Design a protein around this ligand. Structure first.
Ligand SMILES: NC(=S)Nc1ccc(OC(F)(F)F)cc1
Ligand SMILES: NC(=S)Nc1ccc(OC(F)(F)F)cc1
Ligand SMILES: [Ca+2]
Ligand SMILES: [Ca+2]
Lengths: 204, 204
């Protein structure tokens, strides 16, 4: 009776762990495929499932961090979004913090994604006329010639600057998409996806 | 490439169908066990998953209706809740509508649950001093001596009436709990629960 409820609670935690892993892989695929509405709906589902979990493995935690990074990148141009308690932190800044916090290899792609997020953290402020906010973002983030080039753009208020087109928002998105693809490779092995795929194939 | 994405979308629909069935059984168990917070968190998860589904089988639809009934019964005393577009409809009234709409057998238990919900739809208005609202609930719902007994209580404003203790809120809850148990029996066969349970047992 008391031990029966304990078995039930354990089974529900195993099932929730599977649902989280499936939702996390489905969210990454949507980001990669540009399916914004699916991303939005899958994120809501993943967040709710997390609220119903208590124990998280290191792999599940790292996986949750990846989904948060993607969510903030997707809201990168939404400066009215507050993802941190400090209301001064921009979405792209919050993503950078996560990117630097994820337990992952620091390969060339990692640094390129990092540097593109820093450039775009400033560019989205300039592109909304928020020149004082770009200066504040710049100080919280800041590569000496790279740093001095950005400050020069902020002070002159040149919003449509050529530098921001060479290291554009699309460029940042594509490199982030390349990373997700590598991740998606590793998560196509999840239990729920594998089982569902077999059913689909069984009916083909 | 185009057919690959189609297979992926099909597999995600099969996985979502499994997640819905698991969440629906977990929600019923919490209601039965009196775990209110788990019910609240599981309901949020189930609602999000539904927003990510397009096709629903008749069994999945009937199952969704059961969960909605339970949600409204749980908010039966929350008269500030609007579950219907008509803001005049009380939560218990909305549950009664669903109870009369579910494709299920109309056994003695079915009618008893129905009659107890009708009594309590009036009793929760009286118990908040909302005597005019009890009269409006009464007209939208209304067994001639049964009907005339309730109107007599409403007009005399007797809120703590003995009739409302014989056919009490707890009594309505217990009979609804008996039904869920029968339902829970049939849903313990779901794929996710079965698989998770095996894992738990494999580690016992
Ligand atoms: N507001 C935000 S960024 N919250 C959030 C939490 C968790 C999360 O991972 C996921 F649930 F999707 F797996 C994504 C976003
Ligand atoms: N507001 C309400 S009553 N909405 C709701 C929708 C669906 C539902 O079934 C479930 F998702 F839980 F399976 C429960 C409640
Ligand atoms: Ca702002
Ligand atoms: Ca009201």
């Amino acid at each position: 009776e008391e031990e029966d409820a304990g078995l039930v609670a354990e089974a529900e935690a195993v099932a929730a762990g599977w649902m989280l892993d499936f939702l996390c892989l489905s969210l990454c695929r949507a980001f990669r495929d540009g399916r914004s509405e699916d991303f939005r709906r899958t994120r809501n589902s993943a967040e709710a499932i997390i609220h119903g979990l208590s124990s998280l493995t290191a792999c599940q935690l790292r996986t949750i961090y990846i989904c948060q990074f993607l969510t903030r990148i997707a809201a990168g141009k939404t400066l009215d979004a507050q993802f941190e308690n400090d209301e001064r932190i921009t979405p792209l800044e919050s993503a950078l913090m996560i990117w630097g916090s994820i337990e992952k290899e620091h390969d060339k792609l990692h640094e390129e994604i990092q540097n593109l997020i820093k450039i775009q953290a400033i560019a989205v402020c300039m592109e909304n006329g928020n020149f004082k906010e770009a200066e504040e973002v710049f100080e919280r983030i800041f590569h000496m010639p790279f740093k001095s080039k950005l400050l020069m753009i902020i002070s002159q208020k040149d919003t449509f600057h050529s530098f921001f087109q060479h290291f554009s928002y699309n460029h940042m998105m594509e490199k982030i998409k390349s990373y997700v693809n590598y991740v998606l490779s590793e998560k196509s092995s999840t239990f729920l996806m594998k089982a569902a795929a077999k059913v689909v194939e069984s009916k083909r």
